[PDB]
Design a protein around this ligand. Structure first.
Ligand SMILES: *[B@@]1([O])O[C]([C]C([O])=O)C2=[C][C]=[C][C]=C21
Ligand SMILES: [Cl-]
Ligand SMILES: [Cl-]
Length: 263
């Protein structure tokens, strides 16, 4: 069964033409399915989870933080800001920016989360404090998505991100209020229907965060509640050889189906 899954993932990777990274943690039996799980991949917008979590951690000692008002200026706009562009010259709260970053992948929102915890090195130090040595957020939006092969900036490994996502969503990295808030935000994601969700039965409940970037980089990280089962954590990262390659969300869906068949 395990050899079969490995063969199927290798065949999927070969067909895709790119480089595939998978880590599944099954909390029913504390098992894992790993494929290139210690290699680095550009996170792209999947890094928005760590930034939102760092804001939530800060809020544990700062009860006015989520309500804090943040001005949205023309000079804050970057390349993709579906929510923030509606609020130029007004303010949004940090809770609203967290939701926009997580549920729409809004880049202004991500930059405000980064800024309000101290910058990329502070988001990285938060990961370190959780026991994640691998995660590195080097840059802000939009440059963190370049995803150049061989470039370690703005990368993590599938294993590291799966273990950290377990801690954030199912474990004790965050206090109960803050963990529940992260889970609710991720369950409300609007961007993930073509990725991991597309490879799972319709009845399963998912909280996920997608990402895309240069070199056809196509990513998704998820917490999954299968029908009447203990939850799963799944990271699917994918990147391609050509600078202008198009996204391959089908590859993420295929990987999700391969690693969950039988559950
Ligand atoms: B970030 O990688 O996530 C979205 C795309 C997605 O949801 O997969 C996006 C869009 C534009 C810039 C950065 C990102
Ligand atoms: Cl951890
Ligand atoms: Cl179905």
């Amino acid at each position: 069964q395990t050899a079969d899954v490995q063969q199927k993932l290798a065949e999927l990777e070969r067909q895709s033409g790119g480089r595939l990274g998978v880590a599944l943690i099954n909390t029913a039996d504390n098992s894992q399915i790993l494929y290139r799980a210690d290699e680095r991949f550009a996170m792209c917008s999947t890094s928005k989870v760590m930034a939102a979590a760092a804001v939530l951690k800060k809020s544990e000692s700062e009860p006015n933080l989520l309500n804090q008002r943040v001005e949205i200026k023309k000079s804050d706009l970057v390349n993709y800001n579906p929510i923030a562009e509606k609020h130029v010259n007004g303010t949004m709260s940090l809770a609203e920016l967290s939701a926009a970053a997580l549920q729409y992948s809004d880049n202004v929102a991500m930059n405000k989360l980064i800024a309000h915890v101290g910058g990329p090195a502070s988001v990285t130090a938060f990961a370190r404090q959780l026991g994640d040595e691998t995660f590195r957020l080097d840059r802000t939006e939009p440059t963190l998505n370049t995803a150049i092969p061989g470039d370690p900036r703005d990368t993590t490994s599938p294993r590291a991100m799966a273990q950290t996502l377990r801690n954030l969503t199912l474990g004790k990295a965050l206090g109960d209020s803050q963990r529940a808030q992260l889970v609710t935000w991720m369950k409300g994601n609007t961007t993930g229907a073509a990725s991991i969700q597309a490879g799972l039965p319709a009845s399963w409940v998912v909280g996920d965060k997608t990402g895309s970037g240069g070199y056809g980089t196509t990513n998704d990280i998820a917490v999954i509640w299968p029908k009447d089962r203990a939850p799963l954590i799944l990271v699917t990262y994918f990147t391609q050889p050509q600078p202008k390659a198009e996204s391959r969300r089908d590859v993420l869906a295929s990987a999700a189906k391969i690693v969950t068949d039988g559950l």
